[PDB]
Each structure stands twice: as C-alpha cells, then as structure tokens.
Design a protein around this ligand. Structure first.
Ligand code: ANP
Ligand code: ANP
Ligand code: NE3
Ligand code: NE3
Ligand code: MG
Ligand code: MG
Lengths: 352, 352
C-alpha cells in the first residue's frame, strides 16, 4: 500500500505521503496500475481538484523511512471536502489522527477492506515534531525565531537549535488552541486550551468584513489599523499607566472603541480585520506566557495553520512574548508547523 | 465641602457620595445655599440629566464615616458625559482615581480653587473592597457565591464570609480586565490583565447585532444559542475527547462555525450576542483560573460593571471556574462590584 499519514482537523485535512524513489525494475513490474496511478497523480499535480494543494516547498527529499528512500510530501484540503476524498478512494492501512479520525471513522470504512487505525491527536503531534526536527529540513533548521523582535529594522528570521528539545511548551493554534508541556519523548501533557483560535479569527473576520478566505482576511488585516477599533491604555489614561509598567500603546480593551456609534460608522473593514488578528494573537501569546510560567518552561513553540503565510501574527507573537515576559520567554516557530500530526500518524505505520 | 469619591474609567464614571444625616440645627444654618442645593438635588432624584443614575438599592444607610453618621450613595454616568458633569460644577477637595483622573486632570482644574487628588486605580479598589465588606451591606453579606453552580435546579445565590480575606485574587472586569493578587491589607500586586473585557463584549456585540446599549446586548444574549456560532468539541470529534477529559459540549473554537457562509446566513443576532458573551466570559474565567493556580490562591472574586445586571455571565463564571478547576477554585461576587474604586478614593479624604 502507499504510505500515508492523515490528520483530520475541524477545518483542514493534512496528509503526509511518502513517495519511494528507490523502486527497482522488479518492483515496478509487480506494482498494480491503480497504485502507479495514485503515485503519478500525486507527484505530477500540485493542485488536486478545486481545493486540494501540495505544499511543494515543504517537501523533504531523499528521506530514509522504514528502510526505504523517498520523498515526503505535504498535502492539505478542507475537511468540508473529505466526502470528495473518500469518494475518490472508493472509485491500504490508514493511520489517522485528529478529531475527524473518530468523527468520520464509519465513512473511511466504506472503502472496502481498508484498515483505519486511530491515533491520538497530541501524541502524533509530539512524535511528528520531534521527528521532523531530528531529520532536518533538507539540511536546514526546522526551527526558527525572530531575532531582535523588538526593533523592526533589525528583526529577522534566524535558525534555532532543538537538539535537546526538552522541556518545551507547544502551542497548537488550529480551530482553537491546545497547549502542551513536553518533558521528554514519552512524557507530555495537555496543560490547557483556549477556544479563541484560528477559527475565531476566520469566523469573526468573515462576519465583520465579508471576506471569504483566510488569505483574504490576512490581506485585509495587512492594510488595517487595529487602533481604530481597539481602546488603548493611552485612550484611558492619556499616556502610560506608569505605576504598573503598562505602555500607552498597549491594548486596554479589544474592540473597545466600537462602543461608540460614530466610531463604528468610520472604521474600515481592513481595520476590523487587523483588530481581529491582533486580539486573537495577543490572547494566544498571553495564555502561552501564563502557561510557560506555571510549567517553568522558557521555550514556547507555536504550530498549527493559523500561522501559515501569516508573518503578521508570527512577528506579533515574537515581539509580545519577549516584551511582556521581560525577555524570559522565547517564541519559536517551525517550518512544517501544520503537518506534525500527519507525520506522527505516518510514523505509527510499523505498529500495524 | 461635600464628601465624594470618583472613579473615572474608560467607559463609566462611578461616584460615591456621603450624605450626612446628623446635621445639627446650627450646622444647617451655617451651610451655604449651593451646598444645600447639591444635597437636595442628589437625594431627591434617582436620574440625573439624561444619563446619570443613582443605584438606590446599593445605598448604605446610617454608616459612620470620619466620625459622622450618614448614608453612602452610589452614582454612575458615562465617561463620555463628564464634560456635562464638569460644566455643572462650574455653573471642594476631589479624591479621584481611574485613568480619567489623569486624562481629565486639567479639566477638573477649570473648576475654581478645586483641589484634585489623584489616587491609584488598584489601590483604591483594594481599600474600597475591604472597607465595604468590613461594614457589611446593611447587615447582610457583601460577598456571595452560587451554591451548586453545576446543577441548575439547585444553583442559588448564597452569602460568603470574608472576615479573613487573604489571600484573594481580584478580577476587575471593566473595559478590559485587571487581575490582582491581594496578600494583605498593604501587600497586593497586579498579576496581569487581558484586553478581552466588557468593552470587547459591548463593542463586538454592537458591530455584530446593531444593539445600542449594554442592556440591549444582554437581552439579545438571553434569547440566543451560542452553539449556532461556536464550534464545539463534539463538532470536531463527534463526541467527547475522552483522552484529555474534554466534554463534547465544550467550545473548541469560538465563532468557529462562522467560517461557513451558509451558517453565517442562518445565525440570528441573538445567537451572535450570546456567543460574544460566552466567548468573553469563558476567556476571563480561564485567565483567572491560570492566575489563581500560579498565585496559589483558591478564592477568586469578580468585580467591575461587566457583571452588573448580568446573571448569565455570573452563573457561567461560577459553573466554569468550578468545573474546569475540578472544584479547587471558588467564584465569588460582591454586591457593590462596580464602585470599590470610588469608595477607596473617598476613603483617601483624611490624607488631605
Ligand atoms: N486554506 C485555509 N483554509 C482555512 N483555514 C486556514 C487556511 N490556511 C490557514 N488557515 C487557518 O488555519 C486554521 C486551522 O489550522 P489547523 O491547524 O489546520 O486546524 P485544524 O486541525 O483543522 N483544527 P483542530 O481540530 O482544532 O486541531 C484556521 O482556523 C485558519 O485560521
Ligand atoms: N450602562 C452601561 N453602559 C456601558 N457599559 C456598561 C453599562 N452597564 C454595564 N456596562 C459594562 O461595564 C463595562 C465597564 O465596567 P467598569 O468597571 O465601569 O469599567 P471602566 O472603569 O469604565 N473601564 P476601566 O478604565 O478599564 O477600569 C462595560 O464595558 C460594559 O460591559
Ligand atoms: N505573548 C504575550 C502577551 C501579549 C499581551 C499581553 N498583555 C495584554 C495587555 N495587558 C493588559 O493588562 C491589558 C489592560 C491594560 C489596562 C487595563 C486598565 C487600566 C485600564 C486593563 F483592564 C487591561 C497585559 C498583558 N501579555 N502577553
Ligand atoms: N473559569 C474557567 C474556564 C473556562 C473555560 C476553560 N476552557 C475552555 C475550553 N478548553 C479547551 O481546551 C478548548 C479546546 C478544546 C478542544 C480543542 C481541539 C481538540 C479540538 C481546542 F483546540 C481547544 C479548556 C479550557 N477553562 N476555564
Ligand atoms: Mg489540528
Ligand atoms: Mg475601572
């Protein structure tokens, strides 16, 4: 069978596919047409149907996995379109994680003789994260941070070494947020979570602005001024709140200037998109900061697809975590941030 | 001069006024007409202008303060209308706190010879809270909790004793949220804050529903179903997430069902109001829970006017704090929850 890892989330399905590149002449003969058709279909297309995408830039080339050499591919499509995926399958052992491995278990079993093995969402995440960092990103670091995140003329992406990754706080920003404390390869726990995550950003943005994609919401936010919607410390005090070291630019009340009708009438869609992004991102950083202090962990890595093509939120997290922790916490990011559960699922294949 | 305490917040001005009731016949002669006019105006009206309100039910009767007997009155009006208040004053020593004591300092000084003494927002809060609990609410408890907050047919407001109030976590829900750790009468600190507070509720509700008052937003929310907008754990998993003890009814992504256009087209304004209330209230409870665990404090008291006439949020906090802390934390509430800074300011009068 082809080697696949699937993470069926509330919003996106993530698929990791291992393409063997050491196929012998005998092995090519013995492979059935449908199997060759799948491999050709996946490797010769970068868009699948109308909503599937292969993230070609993330491909791991010439990886050794289960004693074979191949390329590891990363593919995503909306969970809404999983019926299309299953119908294509009907017209293999599947290691699957995420909530959808349970919700859609009966649907995967409509594919004859298919064996579905459900693996835990956060177990797969930890195993996939550790694995990808261990093999590297084609010789480059998988993990990075923003150096000098406080000064915009200096702030730059830089590699970060995770050769001894423990302990680690992992903040998984998907539809909502899960926060994990990882103490060893086999010792980790879910600290807490928040429901103010990527689905809140996308859902509120769509309600407030009429955007109809994540990418459109980010484009709007890049053009907006969140301070048109937010009430800042300086709006309440006239300046800093010196006694408690709160700068005048800090947000005192998210969307708090929208209690005034004249301000609601002047705010732009772009301002509202940016205020939504800032509100969600700052809350995620603050919850991560509080969890890191309680867990006594100083390295905080952010994963999940809320941060895909989202440098605004990454830089806001880098700056905010450093600033509000007085430099005690470090925001870390990973190149394959949305796919670790799918990789971890694939890595469970030998157990079956 | 009349004895007043003022807390000028980002949204509301709160005023505490001590009405002497032990006026002698000689003292009445020696009082100037304008002073008698103010006392008559304040005590014979419950609405002041178009936006000022006296909360008559909160009055403390026959209180001994600074060696005199009198009644303590509680009055509120929008900070937007402070120019009207100052103009009435122009056509006394003022102890004032809140951000507006700084922002509007120059405006108060347009009242001839008036002495403005700025006191710290959170110092006044702690002093006023301790004072009101100490004198009682006309013989009744100032502090209450919701007994059996998990079972709706049993859940009921009950008095709570704060005779030894330390330590205490104070969660001040105004425009935004400040979280204080109080270890003694003179030992307290601001732990952190969040910008997702009462102004976020009111501002987002107004944008999403067109409501034009706090009371209207609560009325809408009382009729709504937040699960029409929110994505629940059961929407992602098909049930509970057993491995991490997450019930199917828990919110996985606030507003997360609003990423689907057909759902945005069917959701009601009341559903959106209730989702806004639930989102903000749950986030406040979660941040309070994390701060209580880090501060090693088990009693969490919620104050500020986000909870005025807002039993929905109070009961949600009571239930959520108990449930998610597995019964280790207790949500406490106070009858005079919006006015403690104003009382604390008044209590600073002898220092001048
Ligand atoms: N093409 C996209 N479509 C939708 N959302 C996107 C897209 N790209 C990025 N996002 C964001 O990524 C989030 C989903 O991240 P992801 O980590 O894939 O979550 P999920 O696994 O589907 N949800 P969960 O069940 O909570 O783990 C969305 O809420 C958006 O904020
Ligand atoms: N009549 C009202 N008008 C406006 N907001 C109200 C009213 N009644 C209750 N509220 C709520 O109470 C919140 C303000 O609470 P309050 O404790 O008075 O804050 P504030 O002191 O003005 N702000 P801050 O500067 O952050 O301390 C608003 O954000 C609303 O959610
Ligand atoms: N990563 C990370 C990260 C990101 C943000 C963050 N913060 C957010 C801002 N904030 C506040 O206190 C907000 C505030 C300010 C002022 C008042 C009233 C006096 C008016 C409030 F009610 C509330 C500190 C914590 N913390 N961490
Ligand atoms: N007072 C108080 C109080 C109130 C609420 C509260 N919580 C809010 C809910 N919550 C979550 O984890 C939410 C969640 C659930 C599921 C997933 C993914 C698996 C799909 C998430 F990304 C996120 C626990 C903490 N905590 N405290
Ligand atoms: Mg996920
Ligand atoms: Mg206040």
């Amino acid at each position: 069978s082809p080697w696949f890892g699937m993470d069926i989330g509330g919003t996106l399905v993530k698929l990791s596919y291992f393409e063997p590149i050491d196929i012998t002449a005998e092995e090519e003969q013995e492979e059935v047409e449908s199997l060759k058709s799948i491999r050709k279909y996946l490797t010769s297309n970068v868009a699948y149907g109308s909503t599937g995408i292969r993230d070609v830039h993330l491909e791991l080339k010439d990886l050794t996995l289960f004693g074979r050499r191949g390329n590891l591919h990363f593919i995503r499509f909306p969970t809404q379109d999983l019926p299309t995926f299953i119908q294509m399958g009907r017209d293999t052992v599947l290691c699957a994680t995420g909530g959808g491995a349970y919700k859609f278990e009966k649907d995967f079993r409509t594919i004859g003789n298919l064996h579905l093995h459900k693996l835990d969402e956060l177990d797969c995440l930890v195993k996939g994260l550790l694995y990808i960092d261990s093999v590297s990103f084609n010789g480059q670091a998988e993990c990075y941070y923003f150096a000098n995140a406080s000064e915009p003329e200096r702030c730059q992406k830089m590699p970060f070494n995770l050769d001894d990754p423990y302990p680690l706080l992992v903040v998984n920003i998907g539809s909502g947020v899960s926060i994990l404390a990882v103490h060893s390869k086999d010792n980790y726990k879910r600290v807490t979570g928040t429901s103010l995550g990527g689905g809140t950003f996308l859902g509120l943005c769509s309600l407030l602005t009429g955007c109809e994609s994540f990418e459109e919401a980010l484009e709007m936010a890049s053009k907006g001024d969140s301070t048109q919607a937010d009430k800042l410390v300086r709006d309440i005090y006239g300046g800093d709140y010196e006694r408690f070291g709160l700068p005048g630019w800090a947000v005192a009340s998210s969307f708090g200037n929208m209690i005034y009708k004249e301000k609601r009438e002047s705010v732009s869609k772009e301002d509202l998109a940016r205020a939504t992004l800032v509100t969600i991102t700052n809350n995620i950083g603050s919850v991560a900061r509080m969890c890191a202090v309680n867990e006594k962990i100083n390295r905080v890595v952010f994963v999940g697809n809320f941060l895909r093509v989202n440098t605004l939120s990454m830089k806001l997290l880098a700056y905010a975590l450093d600033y509000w922790s007085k430099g005690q916490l470090k925001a870390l990011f990973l190149e394959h941030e949305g796919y670790f559960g799918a990789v971890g699922a694939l890595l469970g294949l030998p157990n079956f």
